[PDB]
Design an enzyme around this catalytic site. Structure first.
Site, short mmCIF file in Angstrom:
data_model
loop_
_atom_site.label_atom_id
_atom_site.label_comp_id
_atom_site.label_asym_id
_atom_site.label_seq_id
_atom_site.Cartn_x
_atom_site.Cartn_y
_atom_site.Cartn_z
N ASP A 62 0.82 -1.20 0.00
CA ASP A 62 0.00 0.00 0.00
C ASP A 62 0.86 1.26 0.00
O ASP A 62 1.36 1.67 1.05
CB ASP A 62 -0.91 -0.02 1.24
CG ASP A 62 -1.80 1.21 1.33
OD1 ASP A 62 -1.91 1.94 0.32
OD2 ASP A 62 -2.42 1.40 2.41
N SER A 84 -0.65 15.69 -11.99
CA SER A 84 -0.91 15.33 -13.37
C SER A 84 -1.16 16.58 -14.20
O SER A 84 -1.69 17.57 -13.70
CB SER A 84 -2.11 14.38 -13.44
OG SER A 84 -2.52 14.15 -14.78
#
Length: 330
Positions: A35, A199
């Site tokens: 994770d 992004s």
């Protein structure tokens, strides 16, 4: 040193991925959920409330000659899906795909919430976010990657998750045969303890690319892609019959649909998520309403590049002095 381990979807939907991990001496092999959105290595154990164990493999420290109680240490964690666990702490030897850390904090669960109990395939979590998020008190502990880093050939790990198929986590090296083209690296903020990046935009299907900054985290422990409501609306508007359902808890779409792809930007580069990756199947067994793999982050407080996004790429988690993230197509 290096390590290399195969990671395998837990079910036909790729709801999560499990990777075998050796703990203790002699080895006890547990299948952990790696994770990158948390920083605790915790396991189902011989100390876990018996009624909260249902099929998981447990770590039994009393059977490990290298286990030592970390005196006074406790841990307690809550995740974004509302699940939680807590317990005490041992140090022991932990190996992943041939890479060995001695003195790793292994957090032994005394209590786990229902969603963990109900998932017999996940024996615990191995956190790979930054150690500043580790919940051990009163002495915070380091992640497996943080402990291994100095010994690694290169201070990196990579995630290569499969679509309906096994993939690979590598530690200490970049497998140049595992991706196509070049790897595009992008800056990371560690201020929230995550692999947080920005992004450069998105496209829906064959549509034109929208240049827009989207801050989010690269999180292998989250199944879906969570993005701003504007982006998510633009995606689902291209699917006839798709709608946001308050009762179901997100966007659903007719199971008869063919989904468009979704592209996200990494600097000047582009990662394409095929439409099929965005199908998470019937909302309930036998339903013709299917659950979407792209969902709104509104009210989460952060955008999350979960497995839906990450499995479309070869992803480098670069733990150099100034950490960065790399993405390549594959």
């Amino acid at each position: 040193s290096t390590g290399s381990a195969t990671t395998t979807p837990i079910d036909s939907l790729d709801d999560a991925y499990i990777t075998p991990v050796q703990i203790g001496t002699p080895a006890q092999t547990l299948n952990l959920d790696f994770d990158t959105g948390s920083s605790d290595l915790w396991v189902f154990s011989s100390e876990t409330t018996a009624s909260e164990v249902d099929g998981q493999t447990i770590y039994t420290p009393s059977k490990s000659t290298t286990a030592k109680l970390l005196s006074g240490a406790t841990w307690s964690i809550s995740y974004g899906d509302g699940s939680s666990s807590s317990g005490d702490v041992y140090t022991d030897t932990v190996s992943v795909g041939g890479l060995t850390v001695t003195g790793q904090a292994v957090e032994s669960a005394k209590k786990v919430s229902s969603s963990f109990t109900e998932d017999s395939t996940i024996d615990g979590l191995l956190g790979l976010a930054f150690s500043t998020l580790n919940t051990v008190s009163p002495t915070q502990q380091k992640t497996f990657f943080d402990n291994a880093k100095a010994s690694l050939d290169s201070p990196v790990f990579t995630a290569d998750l499969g679509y309906h198929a096994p993939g690979t986590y590598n530690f200490g090296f970049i497998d140049t045969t595992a991706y196509t083209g070049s790897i595009t690296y992008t800056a990371v903020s560690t201020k929230q303890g995550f692999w947080e990046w920005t992004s450069t935009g998105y496209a829906v299907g064959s549509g034109t690319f929208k240049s827009t900054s989207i801050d989010g985290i690269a999180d292998t422990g989250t199944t879906l892609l969570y993005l701003p409501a504007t982006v998510v609306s633009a995606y689902w508007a291209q699917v006839s019959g798709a709608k946001s359902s308050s009762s179901v808890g997100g966007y659903v779409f007719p199971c008869s649909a063919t989904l468009p792809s979704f592209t996200f930007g990494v600097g000047s580069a582009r990662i394409v998520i095929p439409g099929d990756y965005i199908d998470f199947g019937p909302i309930s067994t036998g339903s013709s309403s299917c659950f979407g793999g792209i969902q709104s982050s509104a009210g989460i407080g952060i955008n999350i590049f979960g497995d839906v996004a990450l499995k479309a790429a070869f992803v480098v988690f670069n733990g150099a002095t100034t950490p960065t993230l790399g993405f390549a197509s594959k």
